[PDB]
mmCIF file of C-alpha atoms in Angstrom:
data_model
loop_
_atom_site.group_PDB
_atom_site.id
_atom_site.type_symbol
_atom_site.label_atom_id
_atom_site.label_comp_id
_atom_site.label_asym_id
_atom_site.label_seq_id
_atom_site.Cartn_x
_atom_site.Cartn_y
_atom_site.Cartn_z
ATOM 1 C CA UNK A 1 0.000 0.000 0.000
ATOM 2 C CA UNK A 2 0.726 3.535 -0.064
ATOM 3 C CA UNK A 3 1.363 5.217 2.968
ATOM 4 C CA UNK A 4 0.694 9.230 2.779
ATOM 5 C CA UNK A 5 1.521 10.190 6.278
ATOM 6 C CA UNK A 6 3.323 13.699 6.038
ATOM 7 C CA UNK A 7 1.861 16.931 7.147
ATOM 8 C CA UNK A 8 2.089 18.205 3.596
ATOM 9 C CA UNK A 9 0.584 14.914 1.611
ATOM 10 C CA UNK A 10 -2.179 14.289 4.524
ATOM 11 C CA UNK A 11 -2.961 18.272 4.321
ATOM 12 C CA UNK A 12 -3.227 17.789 -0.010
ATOM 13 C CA UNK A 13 -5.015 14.397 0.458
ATOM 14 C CA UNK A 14 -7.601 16.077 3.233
ATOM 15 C CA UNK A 15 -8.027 19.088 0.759
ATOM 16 C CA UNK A 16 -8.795 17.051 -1.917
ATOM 17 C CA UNK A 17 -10.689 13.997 -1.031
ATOM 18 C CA UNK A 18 -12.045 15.030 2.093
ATOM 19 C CA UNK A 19 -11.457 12.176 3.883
ATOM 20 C CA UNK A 20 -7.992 10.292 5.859
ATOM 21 C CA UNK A 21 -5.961 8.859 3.333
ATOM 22 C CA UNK A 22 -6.146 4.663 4.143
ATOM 23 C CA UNK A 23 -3.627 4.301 6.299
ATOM 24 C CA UNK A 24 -5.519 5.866 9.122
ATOM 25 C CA UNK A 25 -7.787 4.334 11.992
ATOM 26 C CA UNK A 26 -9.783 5.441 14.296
ATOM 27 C CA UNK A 27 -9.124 4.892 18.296
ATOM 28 C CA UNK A 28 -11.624 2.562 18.530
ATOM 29 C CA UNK A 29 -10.672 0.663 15.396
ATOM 30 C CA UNK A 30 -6.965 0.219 16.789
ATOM 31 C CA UNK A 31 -8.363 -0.801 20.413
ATOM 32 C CA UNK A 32 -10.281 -3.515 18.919
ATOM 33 C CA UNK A 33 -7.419 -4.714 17.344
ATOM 34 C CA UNK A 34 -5.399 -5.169 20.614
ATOM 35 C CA UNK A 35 -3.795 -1.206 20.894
ATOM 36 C CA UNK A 36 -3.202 -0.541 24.779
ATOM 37 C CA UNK A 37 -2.450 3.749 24.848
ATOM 38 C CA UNK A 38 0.693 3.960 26.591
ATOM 39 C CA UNK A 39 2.371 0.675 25.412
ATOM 40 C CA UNK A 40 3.696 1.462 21.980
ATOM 41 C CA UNK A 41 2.360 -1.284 20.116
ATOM 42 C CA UNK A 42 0.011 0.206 17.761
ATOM 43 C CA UNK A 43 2.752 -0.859 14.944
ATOM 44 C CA UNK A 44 2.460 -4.440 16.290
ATOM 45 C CA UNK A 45 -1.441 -5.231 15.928
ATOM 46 C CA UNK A 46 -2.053 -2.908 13.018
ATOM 47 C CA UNK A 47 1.057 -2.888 11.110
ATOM 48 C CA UNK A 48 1.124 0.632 8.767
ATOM 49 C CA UNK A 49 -2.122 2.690 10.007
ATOM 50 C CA UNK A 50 -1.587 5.618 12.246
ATOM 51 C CA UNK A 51 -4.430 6.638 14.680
ATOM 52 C CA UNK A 52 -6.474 9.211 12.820
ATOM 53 C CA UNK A 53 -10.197 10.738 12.545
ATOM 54 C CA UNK A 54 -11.125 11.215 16.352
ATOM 55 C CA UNK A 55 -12.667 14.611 17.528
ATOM 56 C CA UNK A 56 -10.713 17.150 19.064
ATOM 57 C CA UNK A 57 -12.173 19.459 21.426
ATOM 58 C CA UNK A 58 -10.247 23.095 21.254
ATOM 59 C CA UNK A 59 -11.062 23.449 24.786
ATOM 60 C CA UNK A 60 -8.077 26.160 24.676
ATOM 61 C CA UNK A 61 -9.027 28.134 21.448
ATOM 62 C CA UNK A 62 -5.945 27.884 19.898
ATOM 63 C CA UNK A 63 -7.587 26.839 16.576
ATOM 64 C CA UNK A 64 -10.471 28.844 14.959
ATOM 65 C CA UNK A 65 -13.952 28.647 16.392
ATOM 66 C CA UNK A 66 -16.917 28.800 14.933
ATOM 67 C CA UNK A 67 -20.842 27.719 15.421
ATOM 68 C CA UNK A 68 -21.334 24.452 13.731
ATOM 69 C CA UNK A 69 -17.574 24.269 13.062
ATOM 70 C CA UNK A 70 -15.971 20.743 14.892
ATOM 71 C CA UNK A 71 -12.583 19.580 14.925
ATOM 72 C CA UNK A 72 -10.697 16.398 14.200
ATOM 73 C CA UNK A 73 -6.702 15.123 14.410
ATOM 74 C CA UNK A 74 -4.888 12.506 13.204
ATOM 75 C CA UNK A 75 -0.891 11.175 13.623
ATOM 76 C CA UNK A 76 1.618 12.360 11.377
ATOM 77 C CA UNK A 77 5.424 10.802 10.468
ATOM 78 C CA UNK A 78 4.330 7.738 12.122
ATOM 79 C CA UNK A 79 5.915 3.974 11.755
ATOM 80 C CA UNK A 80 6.096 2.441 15.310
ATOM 81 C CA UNK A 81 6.700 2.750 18.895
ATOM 82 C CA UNK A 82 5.139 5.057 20.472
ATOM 83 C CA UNK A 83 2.871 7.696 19.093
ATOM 84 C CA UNK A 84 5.236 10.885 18.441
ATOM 85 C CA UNK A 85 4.011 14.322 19.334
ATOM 86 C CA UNK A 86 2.855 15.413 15.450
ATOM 87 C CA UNK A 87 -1.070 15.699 14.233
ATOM 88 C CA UNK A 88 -2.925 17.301 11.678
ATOM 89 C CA UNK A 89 -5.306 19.260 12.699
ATOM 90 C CA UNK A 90 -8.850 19.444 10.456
ATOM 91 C CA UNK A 91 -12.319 20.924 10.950
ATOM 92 C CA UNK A 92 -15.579 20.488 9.376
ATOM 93 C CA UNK A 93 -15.023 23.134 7.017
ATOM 94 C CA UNK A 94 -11.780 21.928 6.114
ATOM 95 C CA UNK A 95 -9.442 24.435 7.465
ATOM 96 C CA UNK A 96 -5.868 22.818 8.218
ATOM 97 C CA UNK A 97 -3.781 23.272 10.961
ATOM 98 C CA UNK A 98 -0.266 21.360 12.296
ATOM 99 C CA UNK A 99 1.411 21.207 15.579
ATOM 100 C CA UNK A 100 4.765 19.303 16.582
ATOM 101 C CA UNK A 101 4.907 19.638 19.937
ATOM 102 C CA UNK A 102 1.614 17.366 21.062
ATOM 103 C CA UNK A 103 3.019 16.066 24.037
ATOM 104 C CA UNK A 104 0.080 15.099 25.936
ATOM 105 C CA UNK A 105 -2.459 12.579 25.767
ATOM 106 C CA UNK A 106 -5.680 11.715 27.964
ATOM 107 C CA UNK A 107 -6.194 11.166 31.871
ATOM 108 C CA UNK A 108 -8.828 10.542 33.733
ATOM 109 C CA UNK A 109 -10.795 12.226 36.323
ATOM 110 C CA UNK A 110 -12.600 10.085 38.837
ATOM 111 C CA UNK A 111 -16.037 12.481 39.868
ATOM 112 C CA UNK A 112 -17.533 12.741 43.264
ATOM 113 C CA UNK A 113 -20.327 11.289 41.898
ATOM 114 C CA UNK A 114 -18.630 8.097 41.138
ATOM 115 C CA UNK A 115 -18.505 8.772 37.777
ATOM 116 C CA UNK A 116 -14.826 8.562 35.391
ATOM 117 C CA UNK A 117 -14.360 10.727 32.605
ATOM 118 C CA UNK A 118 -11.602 11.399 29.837
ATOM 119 C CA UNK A 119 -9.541 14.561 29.207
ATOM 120 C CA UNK A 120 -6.885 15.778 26.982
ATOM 121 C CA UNK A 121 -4.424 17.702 28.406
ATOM 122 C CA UNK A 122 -0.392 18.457 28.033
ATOM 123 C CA UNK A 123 1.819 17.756 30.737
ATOM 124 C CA UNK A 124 2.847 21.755 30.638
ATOM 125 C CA UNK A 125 -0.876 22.418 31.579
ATOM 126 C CA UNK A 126 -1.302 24.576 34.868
ATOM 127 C CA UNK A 127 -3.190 22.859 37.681
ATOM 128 C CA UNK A 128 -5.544 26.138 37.002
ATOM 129 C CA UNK A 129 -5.391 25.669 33.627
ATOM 130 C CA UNK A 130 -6.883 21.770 34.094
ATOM 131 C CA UNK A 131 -9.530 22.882 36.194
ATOM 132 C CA UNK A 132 -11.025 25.463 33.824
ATOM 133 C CA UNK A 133 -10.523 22.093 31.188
ATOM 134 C CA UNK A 134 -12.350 20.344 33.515
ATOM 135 C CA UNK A 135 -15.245 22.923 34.173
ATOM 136 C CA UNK A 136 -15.266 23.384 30.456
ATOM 137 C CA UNK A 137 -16.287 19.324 29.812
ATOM 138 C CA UNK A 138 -17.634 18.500 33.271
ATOM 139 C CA UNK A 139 -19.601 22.014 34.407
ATOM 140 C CA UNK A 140 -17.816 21.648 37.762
ATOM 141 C CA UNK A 141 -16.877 25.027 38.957
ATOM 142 C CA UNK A 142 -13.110 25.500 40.011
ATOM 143 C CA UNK A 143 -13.980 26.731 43.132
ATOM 144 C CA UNK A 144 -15.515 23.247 43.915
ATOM 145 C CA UNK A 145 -12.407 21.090 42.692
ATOM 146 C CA UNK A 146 -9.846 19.828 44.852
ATOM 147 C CA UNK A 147 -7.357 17.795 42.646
ATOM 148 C CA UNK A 148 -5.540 14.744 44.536
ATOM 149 C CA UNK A 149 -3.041 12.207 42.651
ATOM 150 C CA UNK A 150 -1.370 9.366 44.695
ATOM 151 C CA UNK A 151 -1.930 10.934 48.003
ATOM 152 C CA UNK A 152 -0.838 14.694 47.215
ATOM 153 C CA UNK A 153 -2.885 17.998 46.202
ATOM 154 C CA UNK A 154 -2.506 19.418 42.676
ATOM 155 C CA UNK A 155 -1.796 23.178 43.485
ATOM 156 C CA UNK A 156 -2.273 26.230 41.522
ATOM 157 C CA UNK A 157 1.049 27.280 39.693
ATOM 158 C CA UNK A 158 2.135 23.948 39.205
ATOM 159 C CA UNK A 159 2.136 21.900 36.367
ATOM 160 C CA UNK A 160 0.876 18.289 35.117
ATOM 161 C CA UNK A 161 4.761 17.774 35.252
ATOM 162 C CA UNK A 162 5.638 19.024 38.107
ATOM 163 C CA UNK A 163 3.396 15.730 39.642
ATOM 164 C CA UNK A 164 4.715 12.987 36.831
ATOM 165 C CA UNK A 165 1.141 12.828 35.871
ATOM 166 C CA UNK A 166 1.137 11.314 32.314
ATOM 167 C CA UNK A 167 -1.090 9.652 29.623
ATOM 168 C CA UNK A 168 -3.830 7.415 31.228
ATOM 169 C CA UNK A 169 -3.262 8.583 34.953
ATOM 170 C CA UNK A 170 -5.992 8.823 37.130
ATOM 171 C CA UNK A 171 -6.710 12.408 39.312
ATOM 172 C CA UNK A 172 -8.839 12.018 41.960
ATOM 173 C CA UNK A 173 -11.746 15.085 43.164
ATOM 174 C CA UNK A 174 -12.399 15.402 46.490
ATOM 175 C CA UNK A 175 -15.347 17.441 48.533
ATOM 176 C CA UNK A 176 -14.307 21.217 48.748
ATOM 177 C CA UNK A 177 -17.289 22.870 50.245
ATOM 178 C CA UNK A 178 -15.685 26.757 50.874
ATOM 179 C CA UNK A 179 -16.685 28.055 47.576
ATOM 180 C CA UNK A 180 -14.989 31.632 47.078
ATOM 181 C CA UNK A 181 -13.880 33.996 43.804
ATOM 182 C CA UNK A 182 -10.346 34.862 43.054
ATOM 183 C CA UNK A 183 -8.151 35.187 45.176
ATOM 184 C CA UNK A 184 -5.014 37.166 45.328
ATOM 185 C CA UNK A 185 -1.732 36.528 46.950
ATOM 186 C CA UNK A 186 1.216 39.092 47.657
ATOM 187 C CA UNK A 187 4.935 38.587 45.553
ATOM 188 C CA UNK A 188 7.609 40.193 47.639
#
């Protein structure tokens, strides 16, 4: 088969035929075929595809908006290992956007409710930065989140990083019940 997998012949290909070229799958597609996110053997089960065609969410407005407009990504210069930190960016419209630094990947947030859900975020996100992510998806207001990962609070001014937190790591909420606005704090 052909493989088109470059930013410039997936961007000509998506401009053209709108549609992934055929060496693309969807996330679900690769997990049915044995894919495990974090273990680097998409290349193993589905020898040639790249993970492609899933919705992104531009929960940080870094790419266009518009009503009606949605967003999708998909892997570029990949072969195996690993998936790298390139994607093509495409929306409904067909607009095209790149990026090359795509570090991140999802976690998950375990609710008070009980309930688990999914988020994308970067390991350079702010702790303040993931909450407004979180409010964004979930509707939970900052003021009621209180972030915990393997026994210590995610504070404000830190970073995903700073707390090893990676793809498919779980944070945990926990009851915050003070409720308050901004506040402000003094730099000598």
């Amino acid at each position: 088969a052909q493989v088109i997998n470059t930013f410039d012949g997936v961007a000509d290909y998506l401009q053209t035929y709108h549609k992934l070229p055929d060496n693309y799958i969807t996330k679900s597609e690769a997990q049915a075929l044995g894919w495990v996110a974090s273990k680097g053997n998409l290349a193993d089960v589905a020898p040639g595809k790249s993970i492609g065609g899933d919705i992104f969410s531009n929960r940080e407005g870094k790419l266009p908006g518009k009503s009606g407009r949605t967003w999708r990504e998909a892997d570029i210069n990949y072969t195996s290992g690993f998936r790298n930190s390139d994607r093509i960016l495409y929306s409904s419209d067909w607009l095209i956007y790149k990026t090359t630094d795509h570090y991140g990947g999802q976690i998950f947030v375990k609710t008070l409710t009980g309930k688990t859900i999914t988020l994308e975020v970067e390991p350079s996100d702010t702790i303040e930065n993931v909450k407004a992510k979180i409010q964004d998806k979930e509707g939970i207001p900052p003021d009621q989140q209180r972030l915990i990962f393997a026994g210590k609070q995610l504070e404000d001014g830190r970073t995903l990083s700073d707390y090893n937190i990676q793809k498919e790591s779980t944070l945990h909420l926990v009851l915050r019940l003070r409720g308050g606005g901004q506040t402000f704090t003094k730099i000598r």
